[PDB]
Design a protein around this ligand. Structure first.
Ligand SMILES: Cc1cc2nc3c(=O)[nH]c(=O)nc-3n(C[C@H](O)[C@H](O)[C@H](O)COP(=O)(O)OP(=O)(O)OC[C@H]3O[C@@H](n4cnc5c(N)ncnc54)[C@H](O)[C@@H]3O)c2cc1C
Length: 425
């Protein structure tokens, strides 16, 4: 059997390229479910942990031109017979493997189909907003990715933002940092909290049903009914019903583990992903996983956590490919240092954003010290500590605590002496 890699995603492509670079004479199969292959472009090394790049899209032949021993099968996997050491794909064909790597990623949660618009990791705020110019009122559900940036961006019309959370903020920023970012930002923006889409109607069904619809809330005096018609109507969790021109969906996402589960006995993580050890090896023999589809299930570092990220996906695919290569060669790679410190770098509202470690005190509940310095429109420096040792940080705006904070979190020394010194060079 060949080396088989499933998923034309970041982790799958990274794994396939590394496998080709490890076994040039062998053929490495890359099973994909789309004619698009996401490639990493303009890799930037910033430190031993910090890394930045962007994501372009190639065809299959573009990859084949630089990697000839990678043969791509454009037919998504529909079944995995792990006992019989093979996979069956949509065309009806079978392919045996000596070592398999699963990188199918994670699928969304999917009812007003013409007017509900999905978002993906290739969308930008301006590019997406370009189509929403001639629209009177937009409902955005969830905080996924561009959602935050989009809510406070569109100046044209009314935004209604329905979230499961209590206050504003996506997975990156708590309510404080979200408030800091949008300080410079008229926009009719109303926030519905602790709710999700209970039901959706198109006005053809709704007018037959003949139920109410509310106005955009101005004051605390009362809630009245709408007057103008709307293409779509949303009945939210808290029985509130709103008319709407277009609906942006930024809902959650679950690992795309469905095709590979029947007939097998995978050990799943709590979130539904495939559990992987420190070698990206899953519960089943000769099967590895990386990307959004897996669950890091070793004794993880206290300043690291897994997240949906291009950076983590690339790193996981790379380590998985190297582990598969070393296992086939019997080199017995014993690297236990693999993932040391969580880090992420972005620019949201023209602000340089750097997140390190337990940047929101994830997991370390109630028994954590928090320090903060701020300058409105200029700087945000949040610091999370425990037992004198630094556990995470958020640096928004052009600070220069990035390198030093990385070093401090990695060292984890009992810095019980310094007080507010840590917030200024
Ligand atoms: C709206 C949104 C915005 C995001 N923004 C960012 C961002 O700004 N930065 C960031 O770092 N991360 C972002 N992410 C995270 C995103 O999920 C990353 O791309 C992810 O971390 C990388 O996933 P992956 O390596 O598992 O591969 P994926 O990108 O998930 O790709 C997996 C591949 O497998 C293929 N596949 C699926 N099923 C099968 C099958 N049965 N057989 C064969 N192939 C199959 C898919 O077609 C796909 O090509 C965002 C996610 C979402 C949803």
């Amino acid at each position: 059997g060949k080396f088989v890699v499933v998923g034309g995603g970041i982790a799958g492509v990274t794994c396939a390229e590394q496998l080709a670079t490890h076994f040039p004479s062998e053929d490495i199969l890359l099973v994909t479910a789309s004619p698009v292959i996401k490639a990493v472009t303009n890799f930037k090394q910033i430190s031993k942990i910090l890394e930045e790049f962007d994501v372009e899209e190639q065809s299959s032949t573009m990859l084949g031109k630089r990697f000839p021993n990678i043969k791509v099968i454009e037919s998504g996997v529909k079944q995995l017979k792990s006992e019989e050491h093979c996979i069956v794909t949509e065309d009806g064909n079978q392919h045996v493997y000596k070592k398999l790597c699963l990188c199918a990623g994670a699928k969304p949660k999917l009812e007003g189909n013409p007017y509900v618009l999905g978002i993906r990791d290739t969308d930008s705020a301006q590019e997406f907003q370009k189509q929403l110019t001639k629209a009177k009122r937009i409902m955005i559900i969830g905080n996924g990715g561009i959602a935050l940036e989009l809510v406070y961006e569109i100046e044209g019309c009314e935004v209604i933002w329905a979230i499961k959370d209590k206050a504003i903020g996506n997975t990156f920023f708590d309510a404080g940092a979200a408030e800091f970012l949008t300080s410079k930002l008229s926009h009719k923006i109303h926030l519905e909290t602790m709710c999700e889409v209970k039901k959706i109607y198109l006005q053809d069904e709704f007018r037959i049903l003949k139920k109410k619809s509310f106005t955009f809330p101005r004051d605390h005096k009362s809630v009245t009914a709408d007057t103008e018609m709307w293409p779509v109507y949303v009945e939210l969790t808290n029985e509130k019903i709103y008319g709407c021109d277009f609906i942006v969906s930024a809902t959650g996402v679950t690992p795309n583990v469905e095709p590979f589960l029947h007939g097998n006995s995978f050990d799943l993580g709590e979130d539904g992903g495939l559990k992987v050890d420190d070698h990206m090896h899953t519960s089943l023999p000769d099967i590895y996983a990386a990307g959004d589809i897996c669950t890091t299930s070793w004794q993880l570092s206290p300043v690291w956590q897994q997240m949906r990220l291009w950076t983590q996906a690339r790193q996981m695919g790379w380590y998985a490919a190297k582990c598969m290569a070393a296992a086939s060669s019997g080199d017995s790679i014993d690297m236990d240092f693999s993932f040391e410190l969580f880090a992420h770098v972005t620019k949201f509202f023209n602000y340089k954003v750097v997140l390190l470690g337990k940047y929101n005190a994830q997991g370390l509940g109630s028994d954590h010290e928090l320090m903060l310095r701020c300058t409105k429109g200029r700087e945000y420096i949040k610091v999370v500590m425990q037992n004198g040792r630094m556990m995470g940080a958020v640096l928004i705006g052009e600070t220069d605590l990035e390198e030093t904070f990385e070093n401090l979190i990695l060292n984890q020394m009992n810095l019980s002496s310094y007080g507010e010194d840590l917030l200024d060079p």
